[PDB]
Structure 1
Amino acid sequence: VFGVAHIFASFNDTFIHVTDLSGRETLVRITGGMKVKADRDESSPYAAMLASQDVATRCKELGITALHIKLRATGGNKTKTPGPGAQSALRALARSGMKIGRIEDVTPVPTDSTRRKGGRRGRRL
Structure 2
Amino acid sequence: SSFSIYPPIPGQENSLRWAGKKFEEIPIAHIKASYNNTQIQVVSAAHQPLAHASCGTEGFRNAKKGTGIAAQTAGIAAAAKATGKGVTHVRVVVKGLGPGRLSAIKGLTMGGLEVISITDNTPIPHNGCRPRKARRL
TM-score, normalisation: structure 2: 0.76
Taking the aligned partners of 2:60 and 2:108, their CA distance within structure 1 comes to 23
Q: Any gaps of 5 or more consecutive residues in structure 2?
A: 1-18, 20-25
Taking the aligned partners of 1:63 and 1:33, their CA distance within structure 2 comes to 24
Which of residues 50, 64, 77 in structure 1 aligns to 2:87? Answer: 64
Taking the aligned partners of 1:106 and 1:50, their CA distance within structure 2 comes to 22
Q: Give me the identity figure in percent.
A: 29
- Count residues in correspondence: 113
Taking the aligned partners of 2:60 and 2:103, their CA distance within structure 1 comes to 19
Q: Name the counterpart of 1:86.
A: 101
- Larger gyration radius, structure 1 or structure 2: 2
Q: Any gaps of 5 or more consecutive residues in structure 1?
A: 74-81
Which of residues 51, 66, 74 in structure 2 aligns to 1:43? Answer: 66
Taking the aligned partners of 2:80 and 2:113, their CA distance within structure 1 comes to 9
Higher relative contact order (CA 8 A, sep 6+): 1
Q: Name the counterpart of 2:54.
A: 31
